[PDB]
Amino acid sequence: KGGAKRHR
Amino acid sequence: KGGAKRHR
Amino acid sequence: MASMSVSTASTEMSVRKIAAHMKSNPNAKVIFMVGAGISTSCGIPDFRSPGTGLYHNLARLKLPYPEAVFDVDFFQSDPLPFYTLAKELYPGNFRPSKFHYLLKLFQDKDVLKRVYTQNIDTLERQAGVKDDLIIEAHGSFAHCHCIGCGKVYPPQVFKSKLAEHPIKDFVKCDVCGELVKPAIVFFGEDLPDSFSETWLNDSEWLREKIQQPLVIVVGTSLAVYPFASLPEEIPRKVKRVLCNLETVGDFKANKRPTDLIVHQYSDEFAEQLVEELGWQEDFEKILTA
Amino acid sequence: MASMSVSTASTEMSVRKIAAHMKSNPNAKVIFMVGAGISTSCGIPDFRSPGTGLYHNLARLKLPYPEAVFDVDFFQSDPLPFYTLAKELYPGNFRPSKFHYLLKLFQDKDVLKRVYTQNIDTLERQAGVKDDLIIEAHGSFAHCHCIGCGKVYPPQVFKSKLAEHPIKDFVKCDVCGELVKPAIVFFGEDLPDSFSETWLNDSEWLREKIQQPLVIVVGTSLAVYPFASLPEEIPRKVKRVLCNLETVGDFKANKRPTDLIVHQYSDEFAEQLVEELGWQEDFEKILTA
Ligand SMILES: Nc1ncnc2c1ncn2[C@@H]1O[C@H](COP(=O)(O)OP(=O)(O)OC[C@H]2NC[C@H](O)[C@@H]2O)[C@@H](O)[C@H]1O
Ligand SMILES: Nc1ncnc2c1ncn2[C@@H]1O[C@H](COP(=O)(O)OP(=O)(O)OC[C@H]2NC[C@H](O)[C@@H]2O)[C@@H](O)[C@H]1O
Ligand SMILES: [Zn+2]
Ligand SMILES: [Zn+2]
Predict the structure, then answer these.
(1) What are the pocket residues of ligand 2 if the criterion is a CB atom closer than 6 Å to any ligand atom?
(2) Ligand 1 atom at minimal distance to the Cα of residue C221
(3) Fewer CB within 10 Å: C terminus or N terminus of chain D?
(4) Domains of chain D: residue spans and CATH
């Protein structure tokens, strides 16, 4: 689904 | 002397 | 709203191509993907910038670092920082930029397929873009829920707590007792289902149009995931445009032959497009209302 | 003045090394090279940012693009834009940042050899750094001269013209008739002789110390020449430190084994250094006066 809001 | 104030 | 070019270098020709592609494919629509860049001219203070007063109240309230204001664990240990930023950034405190209205114009010309925004100021909606056409991937203040049981809360209950001097005694869930927060997506949290569900149907919509499609990416440094995945996930045969001050993300990683890069401010970009499109007429109207 | 880290990542250890190097070489001095980054927390509006009101008055006055306000040919064809920016950015309208005072502390601890600034706000001087130790490579408003014959003018004559509503009828030389402007160096113009003359004696000073020297580069994107040449012209055997949000210039082009890069805000950097140095005592004093 895209994972969790993050960086990289 | 470094030339004139510029970019690059 | 007044704008100006970002360098002496003209970008009208590059922008001209965009209008050219739209004239060639009249029955086509555009997919926008935007970020914080399109709202800077609106006066929204950057919490990561030592120039804004917002940054300093945060620093004073002992916030360890900027992005922690959008951190679940920190919010629960101390919500005052977030509440303070909410007070300063709440929707309605600012007005839409010229670029925001450009989206509205496109909706009027029926050439807008969707606008994926990672901003939380909700200026697209506030500028008239219809709900159906908007994807606020990082949420908004329009909704509120308990971070513990998920019960729903009217957005007003949170907002009324923002005017008190000082801000104290926060909104606790009256079911489980945990903190209630705005439907803003925090780091470590997932995005709403509609982000992937809409991207899914929009990914197929694009592959099936290849009236050629046109996806315009504006004002984002593409540094936050999963939002930043949409660009590389664009059909290789669909033209990609980038309106940013720097070439970033996938446009810098794996540039595509057909890529069009326009180093310009989002408001100056809007001024040029509406010129090469010949829509100054309907534009001026919108802007004066 | 309150600050905070720029990421969750701690930079105290890296800053610790800086203090370590200073403790090892007690009889040594430091050479600073700074830019616009060290003055952002002071509230100075960026004329290149659509967020500042300065930018918009410029856009309205029909300035073709930001940097043109510092263009000789444009100034002569229409000086109102520059005069408008002068009114908003004139020295005295702002106060020194914590980093600025750090320079003062170093001058008090006799560990300051020189500070090369490309900023024109003159906050180093305003914060107490002595004239002898300052190199304002892009000039200042402290002096004024005719762009045609070079006659000297008291800085006041230009300043008195800034309060008139509206601003009109500019300062013309009463010898040759050309426009008189502040001693600010414009693109296309050369820097004052003291920039190279001082760098010359400072380049030899460094090579001859190899009480080891320490050159700290802060808050500059190193994108303007000839200022941006000083770093690569640093003795290869002299340790270089960089305090910026991004690794830029020669630090990105030809990194040196001994380079120390600290991704931190200039004010948070100052907070840490004064801690690892143990000078909080004299610091607090300066800050409270
Ligand atoms: N007026 C204008 N026009 C076009 N592009 C612009 C403008 N102003 C800034 N930018 C560009 O837009 C990008 C904005 O990046 P950023 O501030 O990181 O925001 P995002 O939309 O991508 O991300 C949100 C970030 N805000 C909080 C969280 O810290 C996130 O990392 C950046 O790469 C700039 O080159
Ligand atoms: N608080 C803080 N701390 C450390 N570094 C910072 C900070 N704020 C910004 N920066 C960094 O400092 C750099 C500032 O760059 P810039 O605005 O281009 O200014 P300069 O000092 O280098 O140059 C002057 C420019 N101003 C007008 C002319 O347009 C010039 O190109 C940039 O690379 C940033 O990563
Ligand atoms: Zn609950
Ligand atoms: Zn003269």
Answers:
(1) C 50; D 35-37, 40-41, 48, 67, 118, 219-221, 223-224, 243-246, 248, 265-266
(2) 33
(3) C
(4) 1-40+97-137+193-289 (3.40.50.1220), 41-96+138-192 (3.30.1600.10)
